[PDB]
């Protein structure tokens, strides 16, 4: 007699050669990395494998809306490498630029958080049902093809709708982090400066480089310049 | 004094799909669909058992060229298309 056991073992038809490497996922085309949530190589998979979908590419936004040249600004700043959101000033000393670390970090954390939500460990499937068939068997085979093809077309919708919603929310959250940053400094100098209508603040008082840095790091006391800025606005 | 505010921008970015826009440009994106393959089945971690010249049922019965597969455990038995049966002609209802 044969010894009967029940476990993770399975069978699969494949002509791909065997190599001395490591890979949780295995396909008839060859082992593929399961670091991505979905795959398009083959519907027959063994082990921890990504979900098979009809789409060949599904880009997930890990960055923000890109505007290089011609909402509030005419374009984004290509010279920023130290962060996503930053400041620029034309003061008495010269012209400088610096990034806001908190707003950049807060936008990265939201993307890093949902990025984990999309790549969470995929399904681990071992012995399933055969999806490729050598010859026509009739009613039973027609159902097996229908069961799987239904699962594929449903997953393809679940994936393609996911990237649309996640990226729509990605652009919304990153664009709102700048609206909140512009609103942050907008509250810093209430009536000490006015919104020029393009993303720039016209500070009507004498503000040096250290004064600009006081606005950047959040130590700007408007009462010091309120007696000066208000005079320059209406006179 | 003037204090302008803005965001960073890449010289060339990636296009993504959204609810409203099919082709909208962003600074960075990642691919979620695994489309490339090494072409080779990694023998680890799953205990891969190459079927080589016979099927699983041929080794279960005891075909002469499949005496090596006796008492062999496997996490995944891989049947080759180059398989054949050399012993007595049989059929499994």
């Amino acid at each position, epitope marked *: 007699y044969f010894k009967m056991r029940t476990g993770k073992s399975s069978i699969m038809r494949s002509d791909a050669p065997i190599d001395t490497c490591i890979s949780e996922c295995i396909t008839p085309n060859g082992s593929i990395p399961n670091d991505k949530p979905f795959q398009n190589v083959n519907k027959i998979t063994y082990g921890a494998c990504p979900k098979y979908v009809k789409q060949n590419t599904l880009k997930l936004a890990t960055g923000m809306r890109n505007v290089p040249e011609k909402g509030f600004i005419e374009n984004g700043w290509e010279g920023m490498i130290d962060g996503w959101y930053g400041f620029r000033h034309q003061n008495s000393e010269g012209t400088g630029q610096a990034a806001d*670390l908190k707003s950049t970090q807060a936008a990265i954390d939201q993307i*890093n958080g949902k*990025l984990n939500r999309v*790549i969470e*460990k995929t399904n*681990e499937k071992f012995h399933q049902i055969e999806k490729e068939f050598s010859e026509v068997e009739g009613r039973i085979q027609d159902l097996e093809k229908y069961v799987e093809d239904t699962k594929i077309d449903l997953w393809s919708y679940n994936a393609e709708l996911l990237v649309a919603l996640e990226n729509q929310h990605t652009i919304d959250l990153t664009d709102s982090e700048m609206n909140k940053l512009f609103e942050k400094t907008r509250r810093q100098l209430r009536e000490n400066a006015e919104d020029m209508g393009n993303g720039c603040f016209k500070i009507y008082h004498k503000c040096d480089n250290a004064c600009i840095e006081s606005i950047r790091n959040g130590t700007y006391d408007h009462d010091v310049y309120r007696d000066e800025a208000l005079n320059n606005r209406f006179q | 004094a003037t204090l302008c505010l803005g965001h960073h921008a890449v010289p060339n970015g990636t296009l993504v799909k959204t609810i409203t826009d099919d082709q909208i440009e962003v600074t960075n994106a990642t691919e979620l669909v695994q489309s490339s393959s090494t072409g080779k089945i990694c023998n680890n971690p799953h205990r891969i058992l190459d079927g080589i010249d016979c099927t699983l049922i041929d080794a279960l019965l005891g075909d002469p060229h499949c005496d090596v597969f006796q008492n062999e455990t496997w996490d995944l038995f891989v049947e080759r298309s180059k398989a054949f049966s050399n012993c007595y002609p049989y059929d499994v209802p």
Partner: antibody, heavy 131, light 107 residues
Framework: EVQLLESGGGLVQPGESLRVSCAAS????????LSWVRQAPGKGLEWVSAISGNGGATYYADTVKGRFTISRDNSQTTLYLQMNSLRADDTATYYCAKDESPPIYNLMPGYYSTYYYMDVWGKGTTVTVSS | EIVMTQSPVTLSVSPGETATLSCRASQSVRSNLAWYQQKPGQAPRLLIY???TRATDIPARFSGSGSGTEFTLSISSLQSDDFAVYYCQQYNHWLRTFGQGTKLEIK
């Protein structure tokens, strides 16, 4: 070599302050994050705090949330940790460790990637809090 | 704010046998779970990170597996120098927590 060495530590009375240094040498360009991990004599490990490239942390364990403050000096490539209002249970071998994330995370290189594991551990400095 | 519980506190395993460790975790955690081998009188050493995936130039006998809540660590071919203590951390709640620790004996 990604060697890093912890200096300082010793005997303190309860209620005192202590700053422990961590000279980050080697492969770490120090746009990567760093953390502090203490283990009490005979007790299990415990993550204390973390710091990112530049000042994206913050991030302190609830045991030391109000007591400890982590600092970073990239110009001299040294990680600090000012341990104020030390209590008796703060006696531990404070390890300094580099933090690494999966490459899919960490969008901008300098900022904090919220999913870190410690790969490079330091030699550790022993801090005893007693009378 | 997310406790980890290793089981058992200490296990005795003969050299050569496989030693399976447990790291039960409240709440859900998948993307990160690092295993460490802290030998007495030394700093911890990274073995596995994010579960499953092992660290650089560590032996292939150290296997990691786990989905959520329940996580395991099995040492295939056990050596006499493996008398270290094993810990498990995770993500996130922005706050990484360590495990209690699992002492491993030989013979």
């Amino acid at each position: 070599e990604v060697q890093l060495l912890e200096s300082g530590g010793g005997l303190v009375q309860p209620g005192e302050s202590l700053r422990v240094s961590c000279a980050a040498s080697g492969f770490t360009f120090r746009d990567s994050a760093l953390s502090w991990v203490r283990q009490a004599p005979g007790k299990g490990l415990e993550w204390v705090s973390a710091i990112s490239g530049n000042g994206g942390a913050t991030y302190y364990a609830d045991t030391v949330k109000g007591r400890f403050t982590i600092s970073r000096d990239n110009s001299q490539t040294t990680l600090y940790l000012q341990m104020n209002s030390l209590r008796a249970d703060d006696t531990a071998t404070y390890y300094c460790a580099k933090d690494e994330s999966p490459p899919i995370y960490n969008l901008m290189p300098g900022y904090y990637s919220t999913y870190y594991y410690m790969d490079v551990w330091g030699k550790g400095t022993t801090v005893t809090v007693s009378s | 704010e997310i406790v980890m519980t290793q089981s058992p506190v200490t296990l005795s395993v003969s050299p050569g046998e496989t030693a399976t460790l447990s790291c039960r975790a409240s709440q859900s955690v998948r993307s990160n779970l690092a295993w460490y081998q802290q030998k007495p009188g030394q700093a911890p050493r990274l073995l596995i990170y994010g579960a499953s995936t092992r660290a650089t130039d560590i032996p292939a006998r150290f296997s990691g597996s786990g989905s959520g809540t329940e996580f395991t660590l099995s040492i295939s071919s056990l050596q006499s120098d493996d008398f270290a203590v094993y810990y498990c951390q995770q993500y996130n709640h922005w706050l990484r927590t360590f495990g209690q620790g699992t002492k491993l004996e030989i013979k």
